[PDB]
């Protein structure tokens, strides 16, 4: 479905921070909380792909884009961060902050 890919693409392109998530997903919640802790709400969109008729197609496309079909799937300015574990690694190592500084999102 070109439609599914167009829709996922629009989410990633229109929002600097894009998080694909699902219902009652602890690592989704943890990742979103970390990101909101950088006061990124204004530039973030969270998409619940479980409440969607095309969940399997969305997951398959996220795997084509990132190598994994699991949520959360995290993009920052169209770059693949990955899952919550990847976010925690980048955060602890300083990379996340560096990303956000280069985007003008944190001073
Ligand atoms: Zn579920
Ligand atoms: Zn429940
Ligand atoms: Zn949405």
DSSP class per residue in 30-60:
HHHHHHHHTT-GGGEEEEESSSSTTHHHHHH
Q: Contact at 8 Å (CB) between 78 and 69? A: no
Phi, psi for 32 (deg, rounded to 5): -65, -35
- In the chain, how long is the greatest CA-to-CA distance? 40
Q: How many CB atoms lie within 10 A of CB 83?
A: 18
Ion ligand 3 — residues with CB < 5 Å: 47
Q: How many CA atoms does the CB half-sphere of 91 hold within 13 Å? A: 16
Domains along the chain? 2-103 (3.40.30.10)
Residue (of 49, 91, 14, 104) closest to 82 by Cα position? 91
- Would strands 17-21 and 44-48 be described as parallel, antiparallel, or unpaired? parallel
Q: Contact at 8 Å (CB) between 49 and 59? A: yes
Q: Contact at 8 Å (CB) between 42 and 15? A: no
Q: How many CB atoms lie within 10 A of CB 74?
A: 25
Technique used to solve these coordinates: X-ray
- Alpha-carbon distance 83 to 41, whole Å? 18
**Is the bond preceding residue 23 a cis peptide, omega within 30 degrees?**
no
Task: Find the 24 Cα to ligand 2 centroid distance in Å.
Answer: 7
Resolution value (Å, 1 decimal)? 1.9
Task: Find the 25 Cα to ligand 1 centroid distance in Å.
Answer: 8
């Amino acid at each position: 479905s070109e439609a599914v890919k167009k829709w996922v693409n629009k989410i990633i392109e229109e929002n600097i921070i894009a998080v694909f998530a699902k219902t009652e997903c602890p690592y989704c919640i943890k990742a979103i909380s970390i990101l909101k802790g950088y006061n990124l709400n204004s530039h973030m969109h969270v998409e619940n792909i479980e409440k969607n008729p095309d969940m399997a197609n969305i997951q398959a496309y996220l795997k084509e884009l990132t190598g994994k079909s699991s949520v959360p799937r995290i993009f920052i300015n169209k770059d693949v961060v990955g899952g919550c574990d990847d976010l925690v690694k980048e955060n602890d190592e300083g990379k996340l902050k560096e990303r956000l500084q280069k985007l003008g999102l944190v001073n």
